[PDB]
Structure formats: C-alpha cells, structure tokens
Amino acid sequence: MKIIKLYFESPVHFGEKRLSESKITFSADTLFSALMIEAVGLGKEDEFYQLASNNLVKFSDAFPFIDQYYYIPKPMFNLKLAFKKLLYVPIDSLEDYLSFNLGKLALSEKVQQHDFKDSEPYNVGTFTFKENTGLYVLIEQTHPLLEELLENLQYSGIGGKRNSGYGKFKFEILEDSDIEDLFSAKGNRKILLSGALPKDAELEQALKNASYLLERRGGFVQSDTYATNLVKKQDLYVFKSGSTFENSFDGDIYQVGKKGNHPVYKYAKSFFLEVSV
Amino acid sequence: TELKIGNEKVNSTNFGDFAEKAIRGINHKPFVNSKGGEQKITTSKIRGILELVNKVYNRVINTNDVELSENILADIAYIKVKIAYESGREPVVKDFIQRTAFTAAITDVMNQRTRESFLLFARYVESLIAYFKFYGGKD
Amino acid sequence: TELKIGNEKVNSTNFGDFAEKAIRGINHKPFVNSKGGEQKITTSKIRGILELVNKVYNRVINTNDVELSENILADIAYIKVKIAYESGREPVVKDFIQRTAFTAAITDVMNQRTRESFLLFARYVESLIAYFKFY
Amino acid sequence: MKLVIEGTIVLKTGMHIGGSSDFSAIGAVASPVVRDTLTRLPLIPGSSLKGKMRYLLAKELNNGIDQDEILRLFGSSEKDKIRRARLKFNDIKLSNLAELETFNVSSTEVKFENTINRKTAVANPRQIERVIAGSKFDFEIFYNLDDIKEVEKDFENIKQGFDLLEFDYLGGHGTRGSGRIAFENLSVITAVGNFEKINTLNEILGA
Amino acid sequence: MKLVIEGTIVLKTGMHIGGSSDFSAIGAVASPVVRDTLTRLPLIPGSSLKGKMRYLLAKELNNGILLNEPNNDQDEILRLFGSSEKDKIRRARLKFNDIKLSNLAELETFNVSSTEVKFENTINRKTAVANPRQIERVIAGSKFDFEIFYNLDDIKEVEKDFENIKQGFDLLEFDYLGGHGTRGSGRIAFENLSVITAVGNFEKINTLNEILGA
Amino acid sequence: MKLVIEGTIVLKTGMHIGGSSDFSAIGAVASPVVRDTLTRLPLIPGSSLKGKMRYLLAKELNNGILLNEPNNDQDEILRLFGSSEKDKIRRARLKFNDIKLSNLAELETFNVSSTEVKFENTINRKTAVANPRQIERVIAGSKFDFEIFYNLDDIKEVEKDFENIKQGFDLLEFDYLGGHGTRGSGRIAFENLSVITAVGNFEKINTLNEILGA
Amino acid sequence: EEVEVGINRLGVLRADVDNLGQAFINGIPDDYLSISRTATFSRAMSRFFKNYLNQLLAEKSYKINVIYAGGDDLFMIGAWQDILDFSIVLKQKFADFTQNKLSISAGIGMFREKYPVARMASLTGDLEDAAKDYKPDERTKNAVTLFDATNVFSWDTLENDIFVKLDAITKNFEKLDETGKAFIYRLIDLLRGVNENQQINIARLAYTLSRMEEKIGKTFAQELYNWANADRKTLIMALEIYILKTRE
Secondary structure: OEEEEEEEOOOOOEOOOOOOOOEOOOOHHHHHHHHHHHHHHHOOHHHHHHHHHOOOOEEEEEEEEEOOEEEEEOOEOOOOOOOOOOOEEEOOOOOOOOOOOOOEEEEEEEEEOOOOOOOEEEEEEEEEOOOOOEEEEEEEOOOHHHHHHHHHHOOOOOOOOOOOEOOOEEEEEEEOOOOOHHHHOOOOEEEEOOOOOOOOOOHHHHOOOOEOOEEEEOOEOOOOOOOOOOOEOOOEEEEOOOEEEOOOOOOOEEEOOOOOOOOOEEEOOOOEEEEOO | OOEEOOOOEEOOOOOHHHHHHHHHHHOOOOEEOOOOOEEOOOHHHHHHHHHHHHHHHHHHOOOOOOEOOHHHHHHHHHHHHHHHHHHHHOHHHHHHHHHOOHHHHHHHHHHOOEHHHHHHHHHHHHHHHHHHHHOOOOO | OEEEOOOOEEEOOOHHHHHHHHHHHHOOOOOOOOOOOOOOOOOHHHHHHHHHHHHHHHHHOOOOOOEOOHHHHHHHHHHHHHHHHHHHHOHHHHHHHHHOOHHHHHHHHHHOOEHHHHHHHHHHHHHHHHHHHHO | OEEEEEEEEEEOOOOOOOOOOOOOOOOOOOOOOOEOOOOOOEEEOHHHHHHHHHHHHHHHHOOOOOOHHHHHHHOEEOOOOEEOOOEEOEOEEOOOHHHHOOOOOOOEEEEEEOOOOOOOOOOOOEEEEEEOOOOEEEEEEEEEOOOOOOHHHHHHHHHHHHHHHOOOEOOOOOOEOOOEEEEEEEEEEEEEOOOOOOHHHHHHHOO | OEEEEEEEEEEOOOOOOOOOOOOOOOOOOOOOOOEOOOOOOEEEOHHHHHHHHHHHHHHHOOOOOOOOOHHHOOHHHHHHHOOOOOOOOOOOOEEEOOEEOOOHHHHHHOOOOOEEEEEEOOEEOOOOEEOOEEEEEEOOOOOOEEEEEEEOOOOOOHHHHHHHHHHHHHHHOOOEOOOOOOEEOOEEEEEEEEEEEOOOOOOOOHHHHHHOOO | OEEEEEEEEEEOOOOOOOOOOOOOOOOOOOOOOOEOOOOOOEEEOHHHHHHHHHHHHHHHHHOOOOOOOHHHOOHHHHHHHOOOOOOOOOOOOEEEEOEEOOOHHHHHHOOOOOEEEEEEEEEOOOOOOEEEEEEEEEOOOOOEEEEEEEEOOOHHHHHHHHHHHHHHHHHHOOOEOOOOHHHOOOEEEEEEEEEEEOOOOOOOOHHHHHHHOO | OOOOOOOOOEEEEOOEEEOHHHHHHHOOOOOOOOHHHHHHHHHHHHHHHHHHHHHHHHHOOOOEEEOOOOOOOOOEEEEHHHHHHHHHHHHHHHHHHOOOOOEEEEEEEEEOOOOOHHHHHHHHHHHHHHHHOOOOOOOOOOEEEEOOOOOEEEHHHHHHHHHHHHHHHHHHOOOOOOOOOHHHHHHHHHHOOOOOOHHHHHHHHHHHHHHOHHHHOHHHHHHHHHHHHHOHHHHHHHHHHHHHHOOO
C-alpha cells in the first residue's frame, strides 16, 4: 500500500461550499477530477478512466500527516458510550482507542479593482501547512500512469484558488510497513476512508448498523469544452470519509451531469479500514 | 554583549538596575568635600556629560555597521579624556565618575570596538541621568 | 590619520592613553632641578602651551579643506619656536617637552601638512592637559 | 509540457501590499502588510502580481476594442469565450532575509504619513507598514504549454508585461511613492517533458 | 505610452521631512528625518512631494484661495494627481517615487555627514524660560535625483499637463518641501528637469523637454 | 501671487548665535556659532529671526505689554507669522529662510576670518575668583543677504502687512538678533530692503517697495 | 452619530456561559435531585436570558441592539462605549442572579460602522473562544477579550484593575487643560516599548514622570510609575480605552 505524500509550499484553498472558507483536506472527488483534468491534456483520459473503473487504481481522499505520524478523521462509531474534541486521530492508534494541530487557517482578503467604478472586495479562505507537515493519499497498487499524472499535477496545482495562486505541492510516492498491515489485518467493523456512495442495489444493506454523515458533493464543472458555459453539475450526496459500517460495499464512478460534450465523473468508490469493535 | 563596570558586567538586561543602584550609592552617602559639608553634582554638569555622549549618539544610531568607525572611536576616546578633565576640575564630579564607573565603562567600549557596546553604554548613561532626575532630585 | 612620535605611531584613536602614560611617567619619577630640590611643572605654563596650540585650532575649525594654508604652517612652526624659547627658559619645561615628546609631534605635524594631523596633535596636547589636571 | 518561468522581483521603493482584518491599536500601524500566516515573512500574493500584470497588459495591448492574447494567458469564464489559464502564478515569499540581517535591518518598516485638510489645516496621521526597499522576491510562474504554435507570442507578451510592470507599482499606495519593482534573473526551465525550443524562450526573457 | 520626468531636487536650506512619533532619547535629536531603512540615506517620500505639489498647484489654479476637500479640485489637478469621487473617478497620470539622497559621495568628499542636528528653542513669553529642542535636518546643498512616471492617456492634453507640471515645480521653488518650513527650512530647488520616454519613440517629446527644460 | 521680501542684514556688533553639535577643546571656544554644515560658513537661522521679529511685533502691536502665548497674539501677528489655534487656524504669510554669510569676499579682502573669539569672564563677588569663557561671535560689518517669501492672499490687506513688516524691521534694528545681547552682541541693521514679485506682475508693487525702501 | 465624544466604532459582544451543559447534566447533587428542580433550573436560566437582560437594556437606556438570547450564545451590537460599560454590569448581575455559581465568557470587538457583519460576528467569535481558552500558566475560564485576541483579562481584572485605573486617569486628566492626550500618547509609546526594550524604557518612564510631575501632581505621577512598574499590561489597556473614549 503506497503512500502519496504531499508537501505543500503554498497556502491552499479546498472549498466546501463557499470561497470564504476552506477545509484542511481535499476529498477524493477533487483528487480524481484533478488527475483526470491532467489526463485530458495528455490525451489519456480513457486509459485513466478504465484504469480506475476496473478497480486497478483506487485511492483514498487526503488525510493530514505530521512528522512520522499519519492521521485520519474521527471514526464516528455507533458506540454504546478533554478527549471529546479530537477531530483527527492517528492511524496507528485506533484499535486501542476503543496535542494535535497542523498550521492554521486564514482568510486572504482580495479585490477586483476597476478604474471607473469602485472595487469589489472578496475573501479567499486559505490554509497554510507547517514546514514539516502536509497531506497524504492512500493508494493500493501504484501505476506509472498514476506516477506521471502526479508529475504534471504538481505544476498545475490542486485545490480551489488555483491558479492565483494557491495550489503548489511536491509529491513523494512512498511505501510504508506498519500501515500496509493495518489494511491486511481485519476486525469486524469497517470504517470508511473515502467519499463513497454505495450503488442502489447495495445501499439498503450497506446501511444496517452504519453510523454515517452525508456530505453533499456538487459545484460547477471545470472545463472549457462542456457546452461552452460554466454550468453546475447535479449534486451527489456521499458518505463522509470518517464513517463506519458493518457490511462493506463498493462505490462507483458516477457521471454527474446532463447534456454536454464529455462525461463529468465523480469518484465515489470506497476504501475501508477494517477494525475490531 | 557585556560591559565590565568594576568587575560586575552589565548587559542589555541589567544595566538600568545597576544605574539606579549606583545612584543610590551616590545618594544616601553623598560626597563630603573636605570643607565639612556634603555636596552632590549639579544638574548642569551631569547634563553636560549626557550631551557629551549624545554628540556621538547622534552619529552612532544612524549607522547599521556593527564595527565602529575610526572617527566614532576617536570621539569616544575624546569623551574619555574630556571626562578625565572635568573629573580633575572639581572632586564632586570625580566622585560621580568614580561611583558610577564612567571611565571603566568608557574603556570597555574603547576596547571592544562594536556598535552594540556603545549603544549599551549610551543607554546606561541615559538611564543614569533618568534615575538622577527621578531619585533624590529637586524634581 | 597617523602621527609618529618617537617610536610610536599615534593614530586618531590612542592619543588619550598615550598622553595618560606620558603624564604618569613624570609622576613617580619627577624632575630634579640639580639643586636637590622638590620640583614639577606648574599648571600656568602647561596651559600657556595649550593656549599657544589653541590659537590655531579655533581657526582651523573654520576650514573644511584638508590642506592647511601656509600661514597656518607659519603659525604652527611659530608655536614650535615659542615652545623652543620657553623650554630654553627653564629646565623644567624643557624636561617636560623632552619627556612628553611635544617636539616630535610638532615636527610630525609640520612634516605632514594636513588638517587631520593638526587636529590629532591638538587632541594629544589637550589630553596631556586633561591627564595633568586629573593626576 | 509544463514550463517554469523563474525570476526575482527586487523592490526599488516600499511596496506596501495587501489588506488585513487585524486589529490596530491607537498608536500603531493601520493597514499592515500581508504576511505568511506561519513564518510571518512579508509576502506578495500571486493574485496581486497576476492582476497587476493583467491590468498592464490589457491596458497596453487593447486599444479601444479583451482579445484572446490575454485570455489565453490569464483565463476567462465568460458566457462564450471560456479559456483555461496557461499561467499558474504562485504566492511569493521573501527571499533574501539572509541579506537583510547582514545589513542589520528588518524585513519591513513603518511609514508615517498624514493628510492636511485644506479648510482647517489639521493633520491626520496614519502609519502604513511597507516592505523595505532593496528586498528581493524569488518567484515561479508555471506555464502550461499545449499550443506549441503560440508559445513565442505568449512569452513575448509575458516579457512585455514584466517590462510594463518595471515602470508601475506592484500594489498599495503606489501613486504616492511606493511599489516600484524591478525584475532580474528571468529564466525559463522545462519542468516535465523536454521542450526543444527553450533557448528562444530564454532569449526572449534573458536579454 | 509611458513618460519619465527626472531631475534633481537640490536643497537650499535644511528640509526636515518625515519622522517617527517614537520616544527619542533623553538627550537626543527629537523627530528625526525620514530615511531609507536599508541604505540609511535621508529620503524625500514621494507622498510628501505629491501632496505639497498638489496643494500649491491646487491653490494656484483655483486661483488664490483653496478651501475644499482634495477629492474635488480642478479637473486638471484631478487628471494629474487622481480622484476618488462616486462616479467621476479620475486615474492619476503622475506616479511619484521615494527619493534617496543622490550626492552622498560628494558630501563625503567635504567630510560632512549628510544630516545635521539643528538646535532650537522657544521662549515662554510670560516667564522668559527656554524650551530647547533638537531636530534632524538634511544638510543644505544636498541633491535628490527623482524620477516621476507619467501615464499618457490623451494626446491633446499632454502639453497642458506638462505646463501644469512645470508650474507646480516652479511654485514649489517658492515654498518649502516639509517640516518646519516657515521657521527657515524646507527650501528646495529643481535642476536638470527633462523628459525621457519609457519605451518607444515619441513624436512630440521635444516640446515637453523644452517646456521642462526652461 | 507671491512676493519676495529681500534685503541685507549687516552686523554693527558681534552676534553670537546658535549652538552646536560639535566638540570643544579644553582651553578654547565653548558654544560655537551655527554654520551651514556644507560650507561651514556662519549662519543666521530663519527660526531665530522669525522668533525675535514675532516677539517684537507681538509685543509692540499689543501695547507694549506681552505675556501671552504665541497663539494669543493679535490677528495681524497670527496672519503673518502663523498660528496653531484649534478651530480657526491661519497659514503663515511669511516664509523665512536660513540666512548665510554673504560678503565673505569683502571680509577676506581685509584678511580676517569670518568669526572671532570674544574672551569674557565672570568675577565671584564673595571670593574674588574669576571664571573665563570664550564665545564665538561673527565679526561686525559682515552682511547677511536674505530673502523672505510673502504669501499674498488678499489685495485689500497687503499694505498694512508690509507696514507692519517694516515696523518689525525697525524694531529689530533697535535690539539684538541672538545670543548674549545685553552684553554687547547681536545688534543688526537692515539695508537694501526691497520687494520683488515671484511670478507675474503685482498691480501695486510701487507702493510696497516704497514702504520698505522708505 | 449621536455617540458624542468617542470614536465612532461599533462594539460587538458574545458572552458564552461557562459550562452550562455540565451544570445541566451534573451540576445539581443527588440528594436534591428531581424533575421539579431540573425543570426550574432551565426555567431560571431561560427566564434570565430572555427577560432579565431586556429589563437591563431598558432600565438604563444602553445603546445596544440584542439578537440572541441564551447560555448557548449571545450577540449584542451597538455603541462600543455602551457595550464596554454594559459587559461588566451583565457579569455582575449574572453573578447575582446565579449567585456566583455560573459564569460567562465574553469577547468584545471594536469595528468600523460599515464593516461586514459576518466578519464582525466571526471575529468576535474568535475573541469569544480566546476568552474561553483563558487560563494562567498552570495548568479560571471566565474572562473578557477586549478588541483583540491578546488582551485577555478576567472579569475581575477588567471590572477592578482596568476600570479603577481608567476612572483615576479620567479623574486626574479632566482637571488639567494641557497634558493629554500628547503626554498620554508619549506614555503609551514607551509602555508598549517595555516589551522589546525593558530597562531603558522603564528608566525613560521614570525620567518623564519626574520631569513632568510638575503639572499632573506628585501623587498621580507616583501611582502612574508604580502601576507602570507592577501591572503594565493593565494600564496600557486603561490608557488606550481612555484615549478611545476621549477621541474628538
């Protein structure tokens, strides 16, 4: 299980629903859509689409990491049960759970100035990591297409207020030894680590003793060829990447969008971390 | 960054304390003058000493160079010989330059020819005028 | 800015310590009049030496150019010859000038006819006065 | 092909830049300069450089018409002419802090200004915090080469935007004597891919 | 296109300018002259030159009296220096710059520092006691090589604008540039005024360099 | 409109003025005169002449009784010499300038340097011991060419302003300009007093140049 | 506009109640525990925050608009002088209604009149949680944050030390017709310089106070020096609020 470690040289803006705010992680929707925007410039969109669709390349969303430690969002267990406010927990110590801050958020105030009418101020919510800190993306069975799609993405940036100028990173695809056998080992309750949406034939058994939190995924399509107008794509309500389950599923690459010149994809596959509780 | 006063070095954290301590050394036991009575140094002579070091302080702060110029050190040694002249004039000045060890501090900045040494000595003298006016003054 | 006295180039910075040790040399080893007696130099003659020197200093400070005019050199050599006369009068003043080498300093300032050398020489004489009055 | 336009902005004047919501005391700097939120070095945003370059290029190249030679560089999202932005500006941080500590100065200064009312002749003092002059700013502008036909005209236009910015300010109170910048050590190096005619691009800039 | 107005501000008197409100030393110079932080050269801010030049040119083009806000001066003065009204916003053509000390080396040849500390006081007329102050002026006879950029938006108005620029330069020669001006300081003069185009060639640059050359 | 009041200040007595900002040797001149730092030829500060002339007109125009602050003078004195009252403030019509020693050619023709050293002393009454001082005065007969700008705001008030300026010059001719004045220094005399226009032509420059050149 | 003698700035206040959730769960002991007391305790707090502060705003006509009500949150906006003069009496009357059992944690912010209200609310939420994160070095959660995240004082410090110093400064600087605010600005310019240069600014403070005690009085100069030597953080805030309250 390789590790796509991302060190950032710039403050980043990963928007949720507004430009003024930003979260500290990008979802796997953003990472897959970013990688496939990099693929369409290479003329290799279908190879990447069929590489993900045949479950060969399958990645999580971004999680924070600090020096030597890898963190994940708090698994909302359906427990029968200070330490109350810990939004991120380490991936090494989860089985025994049954101090932390990375950088700070900011709001970089900007304008759109004009000569003969008054300027229009606006805000862009940033997030600056520390110098020993960044994000990581889990990946199984890395690929030379994936290895080079990250090589173009570091010179086009990830996040929102790219191009001006916030997404800038330098990846290291790295391989780890104590967190590949956290995925080889298994328990009985399967926590989710991606923005997954179960298919309609398996949703009703996916949520049996589930404790989830739906997060809406929408926004406008980002291409200059989709019907020559910046048009919103239909909203997809997926589970959060810190939810737990009892019956595992497999998501899909949903094509969120009506009439247009290319299929606008959204990564809603799953990536489970089975643990005993 | 230190400045040996007698043998007790002052840095940028504990020079005003020793300036006030030296003022309370001069006050509460003032200079008996061999006439019988006790005298203390007037405000005009001590402000003459202050403007004597400020004629160099006006030319030191507006330079970034951590090594002092040869013209600045010339005026610092000239300050030393002038203070030695006024100390030879009246002994009330001599007791002041002895107890607030002006000549030993001015030798120390004369040895370690660095801008921070003169800045520390100037803040020491300025704090010393300050505690002269505050503690035991006519105002 | 340099001023070689006997063996010692005194520059613009060490004039005070050298005048101090020159005054401290005459103390603890004073002049003997050859009569046996108890003698040292007065303050009136040494401040006469200074006010001979300072009659040029307060006219030099009018001048910005570092090249001294030849009338100022005439006055400086005239200081030298009046110091020669006053040293010729009494052996106390002669021994003072021989010990605290005023003659060497005035030859150096007549050699290198520049403003900085005379200002340094005046500072040397002035510090000689200051450490005589201090000691 | 991703090309990296690398260079260095040196300040010939103050260059106050940016705005903050930070609280100001009574005798203290109102409108302080923008800094990095962790390291607190003075910072030029990529948006400020991008908007000033776009302003100068669209002021010069257009003569009462925007045509596409600016939209292909900086991007647009209008109703019909949507173009993906080729240039990817980045947030520029202070480069030569090692040089400024050799000169025993900080990275920024407090400029004291006021205004005089013409009716009552009363002052109104303000304190604006500018970067000091003579501080260098090393930047990287990622160029995304996909139309190999027009990279020549686009790099000519980028150099024209740089030398138009050499005569105007970069931000803040520019007309009242601040903001003057100068570009030096401009150089282009291919990040991914191997571009053949990188010498003509580095000779458009490096001259 | 873009023009450049470059010349030399030579001081005839002290010209204390700028300052800091910081607590200066007990024995000190109080309210020092504004400086570049890096080079420690004495400085003319471009804001001070723009504000004083705009004030004198606004008073003269009015004429005589000038008792309004800076936003609604004459349209010539708006089109040079700028305006921020609600619908009548006018972009500034002139762009002033911070001005460092030009002839520091020549001032070093005479072996004088580039700034002086002037001693002053006031006499309390009831009590006849003095209130001493020290102020840090630049020394007189020091030069200041400036550089003013000028936007060129309208070609039929550039001759009138450069006439007003030379008029503001000439009116500033009979006033001060900053600080304690009516108490005998601040007096400047303009020398070697000329116009060079930034890039390109101008077909009507001879008459601007002739207006500003005399 | 702007007028320039120009003339000459000759010294009938010493006129030591000002303070340095310079080290002094031991047996030598304490308190040297202020000099223009570049040439380091002696100077009349514009502030000192403004202060003494303002003192003399505000004292004389009152009735001869003056104990108020500079902001509580007459409306005429606040009209010319400026004021800083909080509500209804006045711009100073006169802009004074630093005044340099002008006729150095005539003083070098006599082969004397521009400043002398006056040897003074005090005698103790109780112990009959002395205490000498040496002060640096300028030499008598050493002219001081000056020029003062007059900000002409209203035509209907300029004649009274110039009559009051001439009254201040005639009052200043009977006192000293700076330094130890009661002991025989500082006495000045104004000659060649004339008024010229800075730019343009004033309607009545004949009746103003008649007043100062009476 | 009808705030006369101050700087025209909006004041925003937040005032979370310290641990009303924990007091709701186990703030009442087991021997006196029933449905009646659990009903009447929430009755009492809802009664306070929805009627009593309306009474307090009405009885002395404070220039304050209130929006929220409750121990969950509060949101008042109005004239900054009335916000600052009402925060202490809200603390005193909450500690009198709850009889020193429940506490609050306010955050006060100074804002310009046409500032975005969303940014006003977010920034005063930052001042709120700065007050709720208040503690000494080891290892007290009731505090007020004044206009900026670094001026975190407890209610005792604001209502006693800052306000007694401010009333003494206002009492001793209204009888003098010359001294402030130029002397007060020169006093702050070195009191805030004690942090970077300690000894020389304390000595310059001593020289300035002994030099210009000829007009302010020897007692006021001695207590200005002694407060500036003991609690400098408090007198800087008192002087800043005094100059903000005496602007124009």
